[PDB]
Design a protein around this motif. Structure first.
Motif, PDB file in Angstrom:
ATOM      1  N   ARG A 143      33.136  49.172 -41.905  1.00  0.00           N
ATOM      2  CA  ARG A 143      31.778  48.557 -41.979  1.00  0.00           C
ATOM      3  C   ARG A 143      31.838  47.070 -41.620  1.00  0.00           C
ATOM      4  N   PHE A 144      32.708  46.328 -42.247  1.00  0.00           N
ATOM      5  CA  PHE A 144      32.811  44.875 -41.930  1.00  0.00           C
ATOM      6  C   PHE A 144      33.285  44.688 -40.483  1.00  0.00           C
ATOM      7  N   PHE A 145      34.152  45.545 -40.021  1.00  0.00           N
ATOM      8  CA  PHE A 145      34.655  45.424 -38.634  1.00  0.00           C
ATOM      9  C   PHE A 145      33.601  45.900 -37.636  1.00  0.00           C
ATOM     10  N   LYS A 146      33.013  47.040 -37.875  1.00  0.00           N
ATOM     11  CA  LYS A 146      31.982  47.552 -36.937  1.00  0.00           C
ATOM     12  C   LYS A 146      31.050  46.419 -36.516  1.00  0.00           C
ATOM     13  N   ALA A 147      30.898  45.433 -37.353  1.00  0.00           N
ATOM     14  CA  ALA A 147      30.022  44.295 -37.004  1.00  0.00           C
ATOM     15  C   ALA A 147      30.871  43.206 -36.356  1.00  0.00           C
ATOM     16  N   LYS A 148      32.117  43.138 -36.734  1.00  0.00           N
ATOM     17  CA  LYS A 148      33.025  42.132 -36.156  1.00  0.00           C
ATOM     18  C   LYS A 148      33.219  42.408 -34.665  1.00  0.00           C
ATOM     19  N   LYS A 149      33.608  43.607 -34.320  1.00  0.00           N
ATOM     20  CA  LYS A 149      33.805  43.937 -32.882  1.00  0.00           C
ATOM     21  C   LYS A 149      32.585  43.487 -32.074  1.00  0.00           C
TER      22      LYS A 149
END
Lengths: 14, 14, 14, 14
Positions: free
Chosen positions: A5-11
């Motif tokens: 979840r935090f990464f899905k937005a980071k990418k």
């Protein structure tokens, strides 16, 4: 289990 | 129209 | 500016 | 560990 979840937005800004 | 998609990960680690 | 955040989880379970 | 991800879209349209 939150990275996904935090990464899905980071990418989107990396 | 995306911050929501990006910040959504911020509140998750702030 | 949200449908994206609504139909996105949909396709994942449709 | 994805329901949170799938459901997060549900509460958004229930």
């Amino acid at each position: 289990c939150y990275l996904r979840r935090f990464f899905k937005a980071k990418k989107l800004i990396e």
